[PDB]
């Protein structure tokens, strides 16, 4: 896992843009698309969301805090099924949410980059 320059959103969101990824200012944060012309590129979205996440979500510890996530799988193609991570982290009063997708032939991916990107995301 690796990042370079930091990106700041008018809505008070601070994060680093992952190396090898193109970035785009989004409505409530940033979208990162893996660079090059890959067969099966990773897509990443990080956002401030003022509304809370739902219950029922199996959680995990994200450093000095707790994260709530869900992984969903759809049919994809040749490169494997589509896997979609949805993970949210408490930040002050609101929350920061990360979204990632990736195809896999070999079961659920770890989503390491997405988790790194969430954990190191700023509430200010």
């Amino acid at each position: 896992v690796d990042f370079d320059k930091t990106l700041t959103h008018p809505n008070g969101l601070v994060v680093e843009r992952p190396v090898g990824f193109d970035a785009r200012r989004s409505a409530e944060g940033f979208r990162f698309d893996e660079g090059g012309k890959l067969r099966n590129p990773r897509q990443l979205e990080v956002q401030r969301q003022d509304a809370p996440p739902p219950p029922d979500l199996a959680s995990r510890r994200l450093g000095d805090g707790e994260a709530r996530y869900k992984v969903e799988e759809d049919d994809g193609g040749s490169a494997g099924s589509e896997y979609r991570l949805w993970a949210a982290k408490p930040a002050g009063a609101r929350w920061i949410v990360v979204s990632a997708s990736e195809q896999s032939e070999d079961g659920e991916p770890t989503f390491a980059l997405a988790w790194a990107l969430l954990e190191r995301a700023r509430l200010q």
């Binding site: 012309k37 890959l38 590129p41 049919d75 040749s78 494997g80 589509e82 070999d106």
Partner: protein, 399 residues
């Protein structure tokens, strides 16, 4: 007769409960395959009570396969009689054909699969023998999978037990070893001359199918090219389009990846991998019943998940599944609202949804590029593969 006399005398050359000599069995098989009146021969063996004897005395399962497949395939009016004799013979020898590569097919299923396969081959027009092809010797790197090589994924050695656990544990080196070999799709194409590309295409397409059921065919197994043409007519596609889709997959495939694809699918974990020539995903083949045109419903209702994964490693089944699925992705495209696929329209400005409903002879090239994207990835969700469209388009241009 005129082959039953021969066969009748040959089986008198053994004990009642013991199996005939390997070479005698080979001679029975050959006689069966070389015979001009196969139904009559069956009817004859049955009159004399020699038909069941034949199944009892032959042989080890490797030779039982050849015998069963040969009879099931060449046979027609009298097929049911061969089917019935085999059934009574399995009372004694239960294991029959169900071992090795074929352990996921009960012996009666092996028979029915050979029957259905031979019938489809004559009917769809791919029964006829293919010339020996020059296969690649490669064992590593891009284009070293069954597409290039002829080596059935099912024949590859077991991945070392320890390495299997490293795979489950996501060990980077091990996962790299058993993964897609290409990152920069363009750089790979750049290093190939037009002659190199054409060579890969002929190697891919000119080889005999690597089939789990060789003796279901009247003579030798057909060229892959012939099977592709046949699937093309069946699905209103083009052998060039099927060829390009598969060439692309096979470029981004290795021998080691063939081993993981098949072994992980039939392992305790029944992984949901993509297998064989067109890299069909196991669950997709089940979901959309991709074998519909080669196997009748009776056989299809009975196939285990692991039998399906095994069939996908048989070239003719894989080619037909791949074609069925391409035609499915095209019909599904036909019915979209291009307005709701802005990124698709954006990436492929000459896309023509209506043309997808028809033959690819009249598809704009952007239709091939788009479908390539939506073959490697989920179809028509407006998320595109950035590199695959150009990759498949290069293969298509070669064809």
């Amino acid at each position: 007769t005129a082959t039953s006399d021969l066969i009748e005398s040959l089986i008198s050359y053994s004990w009642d409960d013991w199996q005939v000599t390997r070479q005698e069995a080979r001679r029975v098989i050959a006689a069966i395959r070389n015979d001009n009146v196969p139904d009559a021969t069956i009817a004859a063996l049955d009159k004399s009570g020699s038909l069941i004897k034949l199944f009892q005395r032959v042989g080890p399962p490797e030779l039982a396969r050849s015998l069963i497949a040969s009879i099931a395939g060449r046979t027609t009016m009298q097929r049911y009689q061969a089917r019935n004799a085999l059934i009574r013979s399995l009372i004694n020898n239960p294991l029959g054909t169900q071992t090795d590569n074929w352990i996921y097919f009960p012996t009666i299923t092996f028979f029915d699969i050979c029957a259905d396969l031979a019938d489809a081959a004559g009917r769809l027009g791919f029964a006829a023998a293919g010339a020996t092809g020059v296969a690649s010797q490669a064992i590593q790197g891009p284009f070293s999978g069954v597409g290039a090589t002829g080596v059935n994924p099912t024949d590859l050695p077991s991945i070392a037990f320890g390495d299997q656990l490293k795979l489950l544990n996501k060990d980077p080196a091990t996962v790299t070893k058993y993964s897609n070999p290409l990152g920069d799709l363009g750089a790979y194409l750049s290093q190939l001359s037009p002659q190199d590309k054409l060579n890969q295409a002929q190697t891919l397409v000119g080889q005999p199918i690597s089939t789990l059921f060789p003796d279901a065919y009247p003579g030798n197994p057909p060229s892959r090219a012939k099977v592709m043409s046949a699937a093309a007519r069946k699905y209103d596609l083009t052998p060039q389009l099927i060829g390009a889709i598969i060439l692309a997959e096979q470029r981004d495939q290795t021998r080691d990846e063939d081993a993981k694809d098949y072994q992980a699918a039939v392992s305790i974990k029944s992984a949901n991998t993509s297998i064989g020539l067109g890299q069909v995903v196991v669950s997709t083949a089940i979901k959309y019943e991709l074998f519909t045109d080669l196997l009748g419903q009776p056989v299809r209702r009975g196939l285990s998940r692991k039998a399906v994964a095994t069939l996908l490693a048989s070239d003719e089944f894989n080619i037909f599944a791949t074609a069925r699925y391409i035609r499915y992705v095209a019909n599904l495209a036909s019915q979209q609202d291009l307005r709701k696929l802005p990124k698709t329209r954006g990436a492929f400005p000459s896309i023509d949804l209506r043309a997808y409903a028809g033959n690819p002879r009249n598809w704009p090239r952007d239709n091939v590029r788009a479908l390539a994207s939506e073959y490697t990835s989920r179809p028509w969700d407006d998320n595109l593969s950035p590199g695959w469209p150009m990759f498949v388009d290069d293969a298509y241009a070669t064809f």
